[PDB]
Amino acid sequence: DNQFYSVEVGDSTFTVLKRYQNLKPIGSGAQGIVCAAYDAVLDRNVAIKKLSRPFQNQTHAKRAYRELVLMKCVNHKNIISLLNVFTPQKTLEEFQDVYLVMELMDANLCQVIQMELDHERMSYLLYQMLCGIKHLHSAGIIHRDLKPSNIVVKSDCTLKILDFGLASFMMTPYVVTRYYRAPEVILGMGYKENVDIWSVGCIMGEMVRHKILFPGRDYIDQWNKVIEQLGTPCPEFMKKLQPTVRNYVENRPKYAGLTFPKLFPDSLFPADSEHNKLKASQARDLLSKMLVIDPAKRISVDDALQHPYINVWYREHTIEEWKELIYKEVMN
Ligand SMILES: CCNC(=O)N1CCC(Nc2ncc(Cl)c(-c3c[nH]c4ccccc34)n2)CC1
């Protein structure tokens, strides 16, 4: 008979294709609920993400269309691949949800962060972020929102990025984390390719320090936590900020904060063997080239890939037009 069946998964219903069996919730996010399942056809495990009426507003719609499109276009070993897309509804009028099926990963970075990693694995994961980011950049896509929760890995230490970043208001219950947003993004002062390097540096640091580098309730708190450790930026950086903002920043208590050996002591890095000793320094060296406020002085993706620590691996539519656009893309 029908091709789909429904299964309860908490406070929602997953009406998926019969080929997917033994649904099990693996995570929750902004777009919706995500489940792990077994695909009888391909004979392998996969992940199923359900988009509940993605056209309910421009915020969710824009993300869904953009996701659905790039997920189909872009292709790279370090960017989650889409295996299938479907909708249990038969017509546009009936259209409601969109299900995305992808390879199943074992976990996201939030989990890896809570554990110590030899230099071999840490550098490898970091190397895969740079590749993926490099690919996204070579496609004209500047993520700008890379974070531990949007990056997943497998046991064999393989890594893939989940989403494609940004391109505003929502009644949603949960907020979005911004601890990894680059300075230029926080101060809206224009950005470039190396804007992602800042995020990678925040993640690498968290992997070391095992704790969020720049916490904070709002961007006000976040900026302080940034200068409180790295120190007030140089003048050349100030003269590149709109006065409405250059005022707020320049009228903030200066710092000339601590150096890197202080921020990331040898205690955090394994310095038992001579090999690990050298890797520590190289690691801290890269950290110091990525955690730089001024983009003009922040290392780039290609130079970061050449770093010895890493080279060892070398418009506005209506909720009716959106439904249309999204439905068409789904029905390839
Ligand atoms: C139980 C704690 N382990 C984890 O951190 N996770 C998160 C990653 C999950 N695996 C996975 N594999 C593929 C995709 Cl496409 C997604 C995924 C995509 N978007 C998500 C939003 C929230 C949580 C997970 C996802 N997630 C497994 C459980």
Side-chain angles (χ1 to χ4, degrees), residues 25-30 32-36 46-49 67 71 80-81 100-111 149-153 162:
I26 47 188
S28 184
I33 312 78
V34 184
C35 288
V46 305
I48 304 180
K49 177 185 182 185
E67 158 172 45
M71 269 277 248
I80 200 79
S81 39
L100 304 177
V101 179
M102 306 136 282
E103 66 194 300
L104 175 69
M105 296 302 278
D106 304 311
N108 58 48
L109 273 194
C110 283
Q111 299 303 312
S149 60
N150 286 341
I151 297 173
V152 288
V153 304
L162 290 181

Side-chain angles (χ1 to χ4, degrees), residues 9-12 14 24-36 47-52 60 108 110-111 147-152 162 172-177:
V9 192
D11 323 311
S12 58
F14 264 71
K24 164 174 48 184
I26 47 188
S28 184
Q31 314 212 183
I33 312 78
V34 184
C35 288
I48 304 180
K49 177 185 182 185
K50 161 167 173 281
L51 266 34
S52 321
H60 280 82
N108 58 48
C110 283
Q111 299 303 312
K147 51 189 72 170
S149 60
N150 286 341
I151 297 173
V152 288
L162 290 181
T172 59
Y174 302 130
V175 316
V176 184
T177 56

